[PDB]
Amino acid sequence: LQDAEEAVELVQYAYFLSESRLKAFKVALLDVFREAHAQSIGMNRLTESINRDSEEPFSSVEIQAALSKMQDDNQVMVSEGIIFLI
Amino acid sequence: SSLPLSSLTHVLRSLTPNARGIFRLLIKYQLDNQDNPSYIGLSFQDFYQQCREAFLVNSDLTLRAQLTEFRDHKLIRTKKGTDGVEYLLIPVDNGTLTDFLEKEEE
Amino acid sequence: KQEGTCYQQAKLVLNTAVPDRLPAREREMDVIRNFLREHICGKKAGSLYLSGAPGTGKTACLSRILQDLKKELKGFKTIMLNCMSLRTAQAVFPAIAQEICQEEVSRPAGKDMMRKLEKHMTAEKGPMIVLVLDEMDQLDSKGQDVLYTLFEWPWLSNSHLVLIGIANTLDLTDRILPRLQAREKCKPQLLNFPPYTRNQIVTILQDRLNQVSRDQVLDNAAVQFCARKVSAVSGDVRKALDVCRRAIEIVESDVKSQTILKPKRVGLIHISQVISEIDGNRMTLSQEGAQDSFPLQQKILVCSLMLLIRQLKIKEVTLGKLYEAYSKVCRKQQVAAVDQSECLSLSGLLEARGILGLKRNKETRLTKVFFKIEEKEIEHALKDKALIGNILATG
Amino acid sequence: TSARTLLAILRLSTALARLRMVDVVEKEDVNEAIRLMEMSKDSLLGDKGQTARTQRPADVIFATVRELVSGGRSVRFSEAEQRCVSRGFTPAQFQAALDEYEELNVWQVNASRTRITFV
Numbered sequence: 001l002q003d004a005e006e007a008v009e010l011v012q013y014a015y016f017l018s019e020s021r022l023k024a025f026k027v028a029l030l031d032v033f034r035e036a037h038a039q040s041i042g043m044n045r046l047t048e049s050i051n052r053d054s055e056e057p058f059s060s061v062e063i064q065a066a067l068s069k070m071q072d073d074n075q076v077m078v079s080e081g082i083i084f085l086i
Numbered sequence: 087s088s089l090p091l092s093s094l095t096h097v098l099r100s101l102t103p104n105a106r107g108i109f110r111l112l113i114k115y116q117l118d119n120q121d122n123p124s125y126i127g128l129s130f131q132d133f134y135q136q137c138r139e140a141f142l143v144n145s146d147l148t149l150r151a152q153l154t155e156f157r158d159h160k161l162i163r164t165k166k167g168t169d170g171v172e173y174l175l176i177p178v179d180n181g182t183l184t185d186f187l188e189k190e191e192e
Numbered sequence: 193k194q195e196g197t198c199y200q201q202a203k204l205v206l207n208t209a210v211p212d213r214l215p216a217r218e219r220e221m222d223v224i225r226n227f228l229r230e231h232i233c234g235k236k237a238g239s240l241y242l243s244g245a246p247g248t249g250k251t252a253c254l255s256r257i258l259q260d261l262k263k264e265l266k267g268f269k270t271i272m273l274n275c276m277s278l279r280t281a282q283a284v285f286p287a288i289a290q291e292i293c294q295e296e297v298s299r300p301a302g303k304d305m306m307r308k309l310e311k312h313m314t315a316e317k318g319p320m321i322v323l324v325l326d327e328m329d330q331l332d333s334k335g336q337d338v339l340y341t342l343f344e345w346p347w348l349s350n351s352h353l354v355l356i357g358i359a360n361t362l363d364l365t366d367r368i369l370p371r372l373q374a375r376e377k378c379k380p381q382l383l384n385f386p387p388y389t390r391n392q393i394v395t396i397l398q399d400r401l402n403q404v405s406r407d408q409v410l411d412n413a414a415v416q417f418c419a420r421k422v423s424a425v426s427g428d429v430r431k432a433l434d435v436c437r438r439a440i441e442i443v444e445s446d447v448k449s450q451t452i453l454k455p456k457r458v459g460l461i462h463i464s465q466v467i468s469e470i471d472g473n474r475m476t477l478s479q480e481g482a483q484d485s486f487p488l489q490q491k492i493l494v495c496s497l498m499l500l501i502r503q504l505k506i507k508e509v510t511l512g513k514l515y516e517a518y519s520k521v522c523r524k525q526q527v528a529a530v531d532q533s534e535c536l537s538l539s540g541l542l543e544a545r546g547i548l549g550l551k552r553n554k555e556t557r558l559t560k561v562f563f564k565i566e567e568k569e570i571e572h573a574l575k576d577k578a579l580i581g582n583i584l585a586t587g
Numbered sequence: 588t589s590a591r592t593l594l595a596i597l598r599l600s601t602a603l604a605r606l607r608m609v610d611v612v613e614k615e616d617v618n619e620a621i622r623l624m625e626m627s628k629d630s631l632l633g634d635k636g637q638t639a640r641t642q643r644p645a646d647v648i649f650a651t652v653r654e655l656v657s658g659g660r661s662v663r664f665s666e667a668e669q670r671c672v673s674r675g676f677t678p679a680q681f682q683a684a685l686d687e688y689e690e691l692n693v694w695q696v697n698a699s700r701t702r703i704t705f706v
Contacts, residue, residue, distance in 0.1 A: 038141035080573035084144035170508030
C-alpha cells in the first residue's frame with residue numbers, strides 16, 4: 001500500500017433531516033442572518049456558504065426537501081430559482 | 087501635499103456594515119490586477135455575482151441604493167462605456183489603497 | 193376587550209413626530225452637552241462641525257439640549273437659522289441681521305454686510321451668543337467665498353461665538369473649507385455618528401410601545417426581522433417607525449371583514465408582503481386576467497432583447513433595431529401589427545415595477561437604451577410557456 | 588463544406604455494403620455512415636450540439652387557426668374543426684385552450700362561442 005504514495009510527493013512537490021449537518025446549520029444562521037446579515041441564503045445560492053469545513057456532497061433531492069421548513073420557522077422564504085427573501 | 091487619511095477612516099465608521107464589505111472587496115481585486123496596463127475596471131455582471139458569493143446584497147435595486155453614499159463622497163464614479171456596462175473605479179492615488187489594508191487589521 | 197382602543201392609540205406613537213427619546217442615545221449626547229459647558233463657563237468659543245449620518249433623524253437630539261440650557265441658565269439668547277427658502281448663496285447674512293440683542297433691533301439699508309454683523313459679536317459687554325448652522329453644504333458657490341467669513345470669527349480678536357452645524361455626511365474637508373490641512377490657526381472638532389444596528393433599533397422600540405400601549409399587537413419574533421433590514425440601508429429612525437406602522441394597517445383592515453357586520457398577534461408573513469412591492473418584483477400576480485404585471489404588447493418586444501445580446505455580445509440597443517425584430521416575428525406568427533409611430537410611447541411606459549430604464553434624447557429612433565438585470569426570472573415563478581414559449585425557440 | 592466533402596459522402600456508402608456479402612445498399616449503410624461524421628465534428632469543439640423543445644399541448648393548435656386567418660376573417664367555429672380532427676387532436680383540449688389565449692387578449696368569442704374572428 002505504501003508503494004503508491006512515493007510518486008505523489010515527487011510530482012506534486014516538483015511542480016507545485018440532514019443528519020448532524022442540519023443541527024450545525026442552525027448555529028451558522030446566528031452569524032449570517034442574526035449577525036452578518038445578507039438576506040440571501042438558500043436554494044442554489046446556499047452552495048456559496050455551505051462549504052466552510054464540512055464535506056459530504058449534497059444531492060438535489062436533499063436540498064429540495066429542506067425548503068419545506070424555514071418558512072414556517074421564520075428562516076428562509078421561497079421564491080423562484082435563486083431565492084433571496086427572508 | 088497626500089490626501090488626509092482621516093477622511094477615509096471617518097467615512098467607514100458612520101457607514102452601514104454591509105457597505106464596508108463591498109469597499110474591502112473591490113480593493114483586493116484592484117491591486118491584484120494593477121500590474122495589467124490595460125486595466126479598464128470590473129464590469130457590472132461579475133460584480134453582481136460576487137455579492138451573493140460573499141453574502142452581501144440580495145437584489146439589484148438595493149445594490150444601487152448602497153452606491154449612493156459612495157458617489158457623493160468622491161469615492162467611485164461611473165463612466166459611459168461603449169459596451170453598455172457601467173465601469174467601477176476609484177479615482178485615488180496608487181499608494182493610498184496600499185496603506186488601507188494595514189489599518190483594518192484590528 | 194380593548195381592541196379598537198389599542199389601534200387608535202398605536203398610530204400616534206409610531207408616527208414620525210419629533211422623536212425626542214432619551215434612552216438608546218447616551219454616549220452620543222453627553223459629549224455634545226458637555227462641550228458647551230466649558231465654553232459658557234470658561235469664556236471660550238470655537239467651531240464644532242457635526243457630521244451626522246446620511247438620513248437618520250438626529251434633528252430632535254439637538255433640540256433637546258437647547259431647551260435644557262434655557263431652564264438651567266437665564267440670561268443668554270439663542271438665534272435660530274432656517275435657510276430653506278434661500279435658493280441663492282447670498283441673502284443669508286441679512287436674514288439673521290435683524291436679531292441684534294433681542295429688544296434692540298435695527299433696519300437694513302442695502303449692501304451693509306461684513307460690517308455690522310461681526311461688530312456686535314466682538315463686544316464683550318454682550319451675552320454669549322449661540323448661532324446654529326444647518327445645511328452648510330448647500331450654501332456653497334463657485335469659490336465658497338461666503339464660507340470663509342463664518343469660520344474665522346471665533347478665531348480672531350474677541351472670540352465670543354460658538355459654531356454648531358447640523359448636517360449629514362456628504363463630503364469632509366476637501367473643497368468646502370480649504371483652510372484645513374494648510375493653515376495652523378483654525379483647529380475644528382469633528383464628531384461622527386455610526387449607524388444604529390440591532391443594539392439600538394430594537395432597544396428604541398421597547399420604550400416606545402410598552403410605555404403608551406396596554407398590550408402589544410405583535411410577537412417578539414417579528415421585531416428581530418423588521419429591525420434587521422432597516423439597518424442595512426442606512427438605519428433611519430423614520431424608516432423603522434414606518435415599516436412597522438404600515439404593517440399594522442394592512443392587518444387592521446382585515447379585521448373588519450365579516451366581523452363587524454351582522455388583542456391579536458401580527459405574524460411575520462403579514463410584514464414581508466408589505467415590503468414585497470419595495471424591493472421584490474411584482475411578476476407573480478398575473479392569473480385570472482389580473483392586470484397587475486405586464487399587459488401584452490410589451491412582452492413581445494422585450495423578449496427579443498436577449499435574442500440580440502447573445503448574437504452581438506452587447507447589452508445596449510435602440511428604437512431603430514427594436515422594430516426590425518418586431519416586423520419579422522409578426523409576419524411569421526400573424527399577430528397584432530404595431531406601427532413604429534406609437535412605439536416611442538412604449539419606451540416611456542416600461543420603467544415602473546423595477547425593470548429596464550433609459551435616458552433622454554433629442555432625436556427619435558437613435559436612442560441609446562439598455563436593460564436592467566436579466567438572469568433567471570422568466571421561468572418557475574413566471575409562466576412564459578404557452579405565451580412566448582415559441583418565440584425563444586425560434587430566434 | 589465544399590466540393591471536397593461531397594465526394595467523401597459517396598465513398599462511405601460502399602464501406603458498409605461490402606460487409607454483408609451483398610452488392611446493394613440499404614438505409615442502414617446511410618444512417619451509420621453519417622453517424623461517425625456527426626460524432627467527429629462534435630469532438631473538435633468543447634461541447635455537444637443538442638436541442639431543447641417542450642411538447643406544449645397547445646402549440647400546434649394556434650398554428651392550425653393561422654390557416655384560416657390568411658384566407659378570411661369571419662371564420663366559422665364549426666368549420667375550423669374540419670382540419671383539427673384530421674391529424675388526431677382531441678376536442679376536449681381545444682375547449683381549455685381557447686381561454687389560454689382569450690384571457691391574454693388574442694381573439695374574442697360570442698355568448699354561444701360560435702363566432703371567432705382574429706382582431
